[PDB]
Amino acid sequence: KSFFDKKRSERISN
Amino acid sequence: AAPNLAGAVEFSDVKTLLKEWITTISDPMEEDILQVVRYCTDLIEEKDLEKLDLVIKYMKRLMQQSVESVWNMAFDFILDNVQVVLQQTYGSTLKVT
Protein backbone atom coordinates (compact mmCIF):
# COMPACT_ATOMS: atom_id res chain seq x y z
CA LYS A 1 0.00 0.00 0.00
CA SER A 2 1.16 3.53 -0.82
CA PHE A 3 -0.28 6.87 -1.94
CA PHE A 4 2.03 6.79 -4.96
CA ASP A 5 0.61 3.36 -5.81
CA LYS A 6 -3.05 4.41 -5.71
CA LYS A 7 -2.15 7.64 -7.50
CA ARG A 8 0.06 6.13 -10.21
CA SER A 9 -2.63 3.51 -10.88
CA GLU A 10 -5.30 6.21 -11.13
CA ARG A 11 -3.68 7.81 -14.17
CA ILE A 12 -2.80 4.45 -15.73
CA SER A 13 -6.32 3.13 -15.16
CA ASN A 14 -9.39 4.34 -17.06
CA ALA B 1 13.51 1.96 -16.33
CA ALA B 2 13.31 5.76 -16.20
CA PRO B 3 13.20 8.33 -13.36
CA ASN B 4 9.43 8.56 -12.87
CA LEU B 5 7.45 9.34 -9.72
CA ALA B 6 4.09 7.58 -9.37
CA GLY B 7 3.95 7.60 -13.16
CA ALA B 8 5.29 11.13 -13.53
CA VAL B 9 8.32 11.58 -15.78
CA GLU B 10 8.14 15.37 -16.14
CA PHE B 11 9.63 17.45 -13.33
CA SER B 12 6.58 19.72 -13.06
CA ASP B 13 4.50 16.56 -12.64
CA VAL B 14 6.91 15.15 -10.06
CA LYS B 15 7.09 18.19 -7.77
CA THR B 16 3.29 18.33 -8.01
CA LEU B 17 2.92 14.79 -6.68
CA LEU B 18 5.30 15.51 -3.80
CA LYS B 19 3.68 18.81 -2.82
CA GLU B 20 0.33 17.05 -2.50
CA TRP B 21 1.78 13.84 -1.05
CA ILE B 22 3.23 16.07 1.66
CA THR B 23 0.07 18.09 2.25
CA THR B 24 -2.80 15.62 1.84
CA ILE B 25 -0.70 13.17 3.84
CA SER B 26 0.99 13.85 7.18
CA ASP B 27 1.90 10.26 8.08
CA PRO B 28 3.94 8.94 5.12
CA MET B 29 4.94 5.28 4.90
CA GLU B 30 8.35 3.72 4.22
CA GLU B 31 7.05 2.40 0.89
CA ASP B 32 5.79 5.79 -0.29
CA ILE B 33 8.98 7.56 0.79
CA LEU B 34 11.01 4.82 -0.90
CA GLN B 35 9.45 5.66 -4.27
CA VAL B 36 11.24 9.01 -4.00
CA VAL B 37 14.62 7.31 -3.54
CA ARG B 38 14.33 5.20 -6.69
CA TYR B 39 13.43 8.42 -8.52
CA CYS B 40 16.34 10.56 -7.34
CA THR B 41 18.78 7.64 -7.51
CA ASP B 42 17.84 7.31 -11.18
CA LEU B 43 18.69 10.95 -11.93
CA ILE B 44 22.30 10.06 -11.15
CA GLU B 45 22.47 7.32 -13.79
CA GLU B 46 20.28 9.31 -16.20
CA LYS B 47 22.45 12.37 -15.57
CA ASP B 48 19.39 14.47 -14.75
CA LEU B 49 20.84 16.08 -11.62
CA GLU B 50 19.38 19.31 -12.99
CA LYS B 51 15.94 18.26 -11.77
CA LEU B 52 17.45 16.68 -8.66
CA ASP B 53 18.48 19.93 -6.98
CA LEU B 54 15.05 21.21 -8.00
CA VAL B 55 13.09 18.33 -6.48
CA ILE B 56 15.26 18.16 -3.36
CA LYS B 57 14.97 21.86 -2.53
CA TYR B 58 11.31 21.76 -3.56
CA MET B 59 10.35 18.83 -1.32
CA LYS B 60 12.53 20.34 1.41
CA ARG B 61 10.54 23.56 1.79
CA LEU B 62 7.49 21.29 1.99
CA MET B 63 8.78 18.67 4.43
CA GLN B 64 10.15 21.53 6.52
CA GLN B 65 7.09 23.78 6.47
CA SER B 66 4.97 20.68 7.05
CA VAL B 67 3.14 20.53 10.38
CA GLU B 68 4.48 17.04 11.06
CA SER B 69 8.12 16.94 12.19
CA VAL B 70 8.33 13.33 11.01
CA TRP B 71 8.66 14.79 7.51
CA ASN B 72 12.06 16.26 8.39
CA MET B 73 13.40 12.73 8.90
CA ALA B 74 11.83 11.46 5.68
CA PHE B 75 13.98 13.92 3.73
CA ASP B 76 17.19 12.58 5.26
CA PHE B 77 16.01 9.01 4.66
CA ILE B 78 15.81 9.63 0.92
CA LEU B 79 19.14 11.46 0.86
CA ASP B 80 20.80 8.65 2.83
CA ASN B 81 20.07 6.41 -0.16
CA VAL B 82 20.35 8.94 -2.98
CA GLN B 83 23.39 10.88 -1.77
CA VAL B 84 25.03 7.46 -1.46
CA VAL B 85 24.39 6.22 -5.00
CA LEU B 86 25.16 9.73 -6.24
CA GLN B 87 28.58 9.83 -4.58
CA GLN B 88 29.55 6.45 -6.03
CA THR B 89 28.89 8.03 -9.42
CA TYR B 90 30.34 11.54 -9.25
CA GLY B 91 31.49 11.74 -5.64
CA SER B 92 29.74 15.00 -4.78
CA THR B 93 26.48 15.66 -2.94
CA LEU B 94 23.72 18.21 -2.34
CA LYS B 95 24.06 21.18 0.02
CA VAL B 96 21.17 21.14 2.49
CA THR B 97 21.33 23.55 5.42
Domain coordinates of chain B in residue numbers? 1-97
- Give how far A14 is from chain B: nearest CA, Å: 14
Nearest to B31 by CA among A10, A11, A9, A4: A4
DSSP lists the bridge partners of residue B8 as: B5
Nearest to B35 by CA among A2, A6, A10, A9: A2
Single-letter residue type at B44? I
Crossing angle, helix B30-46 and helix B11-23, to 10 degrees? 160
The helix/strand count (H/E) of chain A reads as 1, 0
Look up the CATH number of domain B1-97: 1.20.58.1280
What does the alpha-carbon distance between residue B63 and residue B74 come to, in Å, rounded to a whole number? 8
Residues of chain A positioned with their CB less than 8 A from the CB of B5 = 4
